[PDB]
């Protein structure tokens, strides 16, 4: 799993 925001 991965989650990234910007």
Curated annotation (Swiss-Prot):
Q: Which family does it belong to?
A: Belongs to the bacterial ice nucleation protein family.
* Species classification: Bacteria, Pseudomonadati, Pseudomonadota, Gammaproteobacteria, Pseudomonadales
Additional remark text: A structural model is suggested in which the ice nucleation protein displays a symmetry related to that of ice.
UniProt free text on domains:
Contains 122 imperfect repeats of a consensus octapeptide A-G-Y-G-S-T-L-T; further on a 16-residue and a regional 48-residue periodicity is superimposed.
Organism encoding this protein: Pseudomonas syringae pv. syringae
Name of the protein in question: Ice nucleation protein
Q: How is it used?
A: Used by snowmaking industry to promote ice nucleation for artificial snow and economize water. Sold under the name Snomax by York.
**Localization in the cell:** Cell outer membrane
Source taxon at top rank: Bacteria
Please explain the role this protein plays, according to its UniProt record.
Answer: Ice nucleation proteins enable bacteria to nucleate crystallization in supercooled water.
